[PDB]
Design a protein around this ligand. Structure first.
Ligand SMILES: C[C@@H]1O[C@@H](O)[C@H](O)[C@H](O)[C@H]1O
Ligand SMILES: C[C@@H]1O[C@@H](O)[C@H](O)[C@H](O)[C@H]1O
Lengths: 171, 171, 171, 171
């Protein structure tokens, strides 16, 4: 029961998401953070990004039949963090061997030959710090690239190149 | 990484702020937090809100002749916190009585007949948390409305209405 | 494909290890072997050793917050070999440079001024034969002392004198 | 504040160190300090201590092939602090997770069953004080024992008790 200053996330209700049907739990504290991109359209306004959020979720629920948006958190170029499955629920984002032991945050857009705006990157790092503050992540958490845990170009050449310079990125 | 979980603050360099020339320091740790509103135009996108912060500052500088924008921090309806004088430079937002002992945060726009979006209110409270963590604010910091410390209509009926709701608000 | 049996290794399950969280893997055939000691208290029975193994691991994962006991294997004076991270998962025993290119077997005890029993040396020398037969080690693997790659007394003077004698030892 | 303020540190060239080859930089203000012990022999004269520093260095340099002695600063029982790689160069003293966010100070000697002389203990505190005065160390910095972040007997049972008494110790 000790929260030492977290960070500000846009609530599910706010971006008008569909109700989650997920019930599987992620045992705290989490050791790995897997970064990826949605390979979708980017948005740079709280308005546009709220929409982007649902398109991704509806695509995961309505078409892939998952219980909720696959990622735990979403990052927008508007500089806000959109709440996915959150800290407590296991998500579907990086394969069966990795989904149970990691939090998956995904930047909204296709960063293969484009870079996230400084605020996007800030929001993401800040988010992780809150994680450690809340104890959802261990202090020695490890940030891994999506392409480091499975065959995919995600999170995109330019964004990947960037997260490799992060304090907690492990080979 | 500005020390702990400091809820993504937009740097001076990012909103193209004029160089500050103030040099009166703030006696750490501060006890009060005065809230206000610029009573100017409100903005709802990072793009528009950076352009607005610029307007506010150039006005305090080019026209009023102050060493820099008067507030320590500016909050946008874009749900982002814009760096002003910061946690260490004494502001110019609530008179000679309160400037040297409180931190000043202003919401961009006029909140007499308008209400700030939740993402903005969220950004502010999240800003104060990072305040304590940093040691710039007393864990037992008290929030006052601009009205409470100076004869002014700011922070606008509607917004003042809400800050009284804050657990740290005093009379 | 015709044996090769050399697996006289006590399984993690058998000494009641904690669930490992480690996921990075070594590439067969591993070229180097780094011998170290735990600088702790020794054990000369299958009972006291399973105890000591739980201890070393308890320290690594509970105090150091590591994904699992850092060694790949642990040799006891009871003449047995205790499965640590095994032949496939990169251990954490000699640093960022050697961890990826080697396997770390560690003698449970402090041999600064003691020589391990002949049955422990045998167990170790024997374990290495395994690696070769299974293909986990290059037939021409090189043995290095812990102090040879890191600032430490490990594996102890007496034991170090011994390993310098080994045929696969190398500069 | 007020100057000059710092302590008495024996310059690198005074103990005739070999030219550092390290280029990786630390980011001040540093948050953590890791106390360790060379585990080797002690010295009680500027004469023998200046010699010791070299032994340690040559060992980390030509035996391990490192860019310089692993520690940022070395403490001698002569009552002096020997400059290691200093306040700005990342050292190699406590693993890849701590080297980038800490300053490594090592007491030359072995303190498993030997306490350091008051002189040594003062040199160490003065150093840290001087580190805060210089903006090299964060004011609320935290101290940790080598063994708290890595598998090692260091800094020695005796010293470990001594530092666990410090106002900045936090494990
Ligand atoms: C072609 C493929 O398309 C999507 O799955 C992503 O953008 C991925 O990164 C890219 O490699
Ligand atoms: C007195 C003060 O003047 C300006 O700052 C604005 O009009 C504000 O709303 C008003 O309260």
């Amino acid at each position: 029961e000790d929260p030492p200053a977290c960070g500000s996330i846009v609530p599910r209700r706010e971006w008008r998401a569909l109700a989650s049907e997920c019930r599987e739990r992620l045992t705290r504290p989490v050791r790995y953070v897997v970064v990826s991109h949605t390979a979708g359209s980017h948005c740079d306004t709280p308005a546009s990004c709220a929409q982007q959020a649902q398109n991704v979720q509806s695509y995961h629920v309505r078409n892939l039949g998952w219980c909720d948006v696959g990622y735990n958190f979403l990052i927008g170029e508007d500089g806000l963090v959109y709440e996915g499955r959150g800290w407590n629920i296991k998500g579907a984002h990086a394969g069966p061997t990795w989904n149970p032991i990691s939090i998956g945050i995904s930047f909204m857009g296709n960063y293969m030959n484009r870079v996230p705006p400084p605020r996007a990157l800030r929001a993401a790092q800040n988010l992780l710090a809150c994680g450690v503050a809340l104890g959802a992540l261990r202090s020695n958490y490890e940030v891994k690239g999506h392409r480091d845990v499975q065959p995919t170009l995600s999170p995109g050449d330019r964004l990947y190149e960037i997260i490799q310079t992060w304090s907690h990125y492990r080979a």
